[PDB]
Amino acid sequence: DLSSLRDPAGIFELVEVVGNGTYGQVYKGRHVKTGQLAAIKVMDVTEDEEEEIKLEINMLKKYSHHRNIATYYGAFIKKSPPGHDDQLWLVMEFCGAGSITDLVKNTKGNTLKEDWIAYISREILRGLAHLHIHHVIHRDIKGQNVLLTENAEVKLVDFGNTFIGTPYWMAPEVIACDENPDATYDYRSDLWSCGITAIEMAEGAPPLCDMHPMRALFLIPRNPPPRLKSKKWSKKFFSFIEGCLVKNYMQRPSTEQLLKHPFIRDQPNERQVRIQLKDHIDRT
Numbered sequence: 001d002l003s004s005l006r007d008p009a010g011i012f013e014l015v016e017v018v019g020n021g022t023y024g025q026v027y028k029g030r031h032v033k034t035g036q037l038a039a040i041k042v043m044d045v046t047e048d049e050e051e052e053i054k055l056e057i058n059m060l061k062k063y064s065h066h067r068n069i070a071t072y073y074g075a076f077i078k079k080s081p082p083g084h085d086d087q088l089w090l091v092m093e094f095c096g097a098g099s100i101t102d103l104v105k106n107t108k109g110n111t112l113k114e115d116w117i118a119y120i121s122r123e124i125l126r127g128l129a130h131l132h133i134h135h136v137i138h139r140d141i142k143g144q145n146v147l148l149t150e151n152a153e154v155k156l157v158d159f160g161n162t163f164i165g166t167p168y169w170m171a172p173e174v175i176a177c178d179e180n181p182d183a184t185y186d187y188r189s190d191l192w193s194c195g196i197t198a199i200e201m202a203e204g205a206p207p208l209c210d211m212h213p214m215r216a217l218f219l220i221p222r223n224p225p226p227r228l229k230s231k232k233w234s235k236k237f238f239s240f241i242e243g244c245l246v247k248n249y250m251q252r253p254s255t256e257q258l259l260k261h262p263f264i265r266d267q268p269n270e271r272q273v274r275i276q277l278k279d280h281i282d283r284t
């Protein structure tokens with residue numbers, strides 16, 4: 001019941017729009033009493049959307065209580081005059097260091113160290129494993145939706161209607177064509193997306209970045225699986241990319257199987273990498 005939701009008036013304060021417009025009306029927010037920061041997603045509410053939004057709050061409520069998923073705090077309604085429209089504020093954990101895309105763009109040559117890719121990939125997989133256990137498909141895994149805190153903690157955001165978004169991280173099965181008329185999301189679609197996010201960390205951009213989004217959407221189901229440009233990478237990393245990017249989702253490994261991959265499993269400098277990331281964040 002949305003009637004139970006309070007006005008954010010002396011509770012949460014909006015500071016500024018965060019990212020740019022990558023996430024839309026997502027704001028850096030402040031808890032008025034403690035000054036503690038939060039991420040505030042603002043959306044207009046109509047009487048028809050009352051049960052369409054009730055499930056999005058419930059989704060955040062139920063599944064964000066994992067260390068690799070940005071935690072739900074609460075929900076508020078900023079009422080409008082009788083001539084509409086009400087505003088719903090979804091208050092979340094603030095991942096102050098921004099996204100993985102920001103991290104790659106803020107690194108010289110726009111590439112990340114292989115041990116940094118492995119660490120962040122495992123945190124993506126651990127967050128996806130939690131969602132998949134609960135029978136939830138993220139549906140939008142990409143660098144922009146993988147966030148960092150000040151402590152180099154990796155957290156997932158925006159898990160799941162009018163616009164088709166960016167195609168570059170979309171698995172072949174989610175794109176409708178003549179052989180695949182009913183483009184379906186499988187849990188394994190998040191794994192393809194994870195592999196594209198791993199190329200994005202390695203190369204600074206996803207595989208068909210130079211193509212018009214319409215051309216990329218056409219090519220993803222027809223082209224062979226994308227590959228890393230450089231040969232500098234280890235055998236373990238190419239194998240992980242190959243594992244994520246199995247063209248036919250029916251032979252693609254599960255999240256549990258990818259968590260057992262040597263590239264994700266074998267991480268000795270796990271504590272060292274976390275420090276290096278924290279240090280890179282400190283250089284704002």
Ligand SMILES: Nc1ncc(-c2ccc(C3(C(=O)O)CCCC3)cc2)cc1-c1ccc(Cl)cc1
Binds near residue numbers: 098
């Ligand atoms: N939970 C979050 N915590 C933090 C952010 C966030 C994103 C970007 C920035 C930067 C900025 O300050 O502009 C830092 C430097 C350049 C980017 C800062 C903070 C976003 C969300 C969030 C994402 C998606 C959704 Cl759907 C809801 C919330």
